[PDB]
Design a protein that fits this description.
fungal; polysaccharide-binding protein; fungus; Barwin-like endoglucanases; binds zinc ion; 3 helices; plant defense; alpha/beta; seven-stranded mixed beta sheet; 29% strand
């Protein structure tokens, strides 16, 4: 799966209204009473995933194991992506040995896992 970064996910003050997984029954505001990205337990290990089709997706708040070049991170899906994953720059640096800006995008193995792995 293709993984890139988006510094929007590094902004702790960003309202969850600005990502797909806001309100509605499946939204993270509704389920966890978070109102910003910075309130998510393991922020900034968050991002968008194709599994999240948009608002009220049942895939909101799913946890994903991403593997690349010997590294493993776990990220919470909080937003839509057209394909693959877009994650915080900090998270992509962890995944790529600090080479995120240089690489831009990488091919990673992705696996859905229990949310305890994302600190929930
Ligand atoms: Br490394
Ligand atoms: Br290492
Ligand atoms: Zn390494």
């Amino acid at each position: 799966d293709t993984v890139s970064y988006d510094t929007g996910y590094d902004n702790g003050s960003r309202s969850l209204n600005d990502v797909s997984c806001s309100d509605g029954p499946n939204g993270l505001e509704t389920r966890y009473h978070w109102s910003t990205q910075g309130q998510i337990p393991r922020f900034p290990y968050i991002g968008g995933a194709a599994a999240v089709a948009g608002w009220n997706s049942a895939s909101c708040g799913t946890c994903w194991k991403l593997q690349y070049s010997g590294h493993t991170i776990y990220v919470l899906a909080v937003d839509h992506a057209a394909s693959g994953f877009n994650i915080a720059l900090d998270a992509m640096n962890a995944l790529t040995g600090g080479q995120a800006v240089q690489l831009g995008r990488v091919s990673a193995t992705a696996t859905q896992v229990p949310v305890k792995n994302c600190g929930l």
